């Protein structure tokens, strides 16, 4: 209806570390449903960019540290509905995934939601009025810290003052979905 569906994913590392998204993620990612894609980077080649384009017309990608495409911006600020959203791959946040370092970027970008990746660990939490999302790695690709990476991605359902974030994780060989709500 009046909802805006945003797919948030990244750190695919195709084809160096993985060949494809999990079979059970691809069944759920069908064309014609998602309005926008925000990708944290590390695709890492044009084949995965083309795959995202089959899912939505509006694909937004920031530059990861293993991306072949050096034209992607380092970071991006977009507005969807009433929400300003920041996007960055996250290898620039020191130390990795530190919320103090993430918070300074939030203030620097003046965004309601900050999306980052690079850790391959899904996290979504609200902190001092602001919302922070890491979709993890959609392929479960190994990391330079690894320890059992779980494939995952995020869907944001944006309607009026609320964001409903859905987390899809591959745990065992079953897709577990969790739902977290954020209000501006």
């Amino acid at each position: 209806a009046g909802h805006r569906l945003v797919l948030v994913l990244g750190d695919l590392h195709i084809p160096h570390r993985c060949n494809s998204l999990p079979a059970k993620f691809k069944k759920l990612l069908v064309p014609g449903k998602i309005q926008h894609i925000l990708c944290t980077g590390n695709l890492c080649t044009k084949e995965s960019y083309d795959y995202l384009k089959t899912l939505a017309g509006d694909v937004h990608i920031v530059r990861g540290d293993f991306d072949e495409n050096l034209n992607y911006p380092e970071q991006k600020v977009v507005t969807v509905g009433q929400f300003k959203i920041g996007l960055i791959h996250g290898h620039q946040v020191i130390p990795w995934g530190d919320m103090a370092s993430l918070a300074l970027l939030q203030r620097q970008f003046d965004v309601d939601i900050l999306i980052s990746g690079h850790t391959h660990k899904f996290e979504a939490f609200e902190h001092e009025n602001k919302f922070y999302i890491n979709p993890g790695s959609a392929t479960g690709a190994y990391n330079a810290l690894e320890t059992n990476i779980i494939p995952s991605f995020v869907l944001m359902d944006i309607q009026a003052s609320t964001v409903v974030t859905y987390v899809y994780q591959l745990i065992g060989d079953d897709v577990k979905v969790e739902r977290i709500e954020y209000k501006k």
Binding site: K33, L155, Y166, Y168, V177
Partner: peptide, 4 residues
Amino acid sequence: DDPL
């Protein structure tokens, strides 16, 4: 539901 979920959208997928």
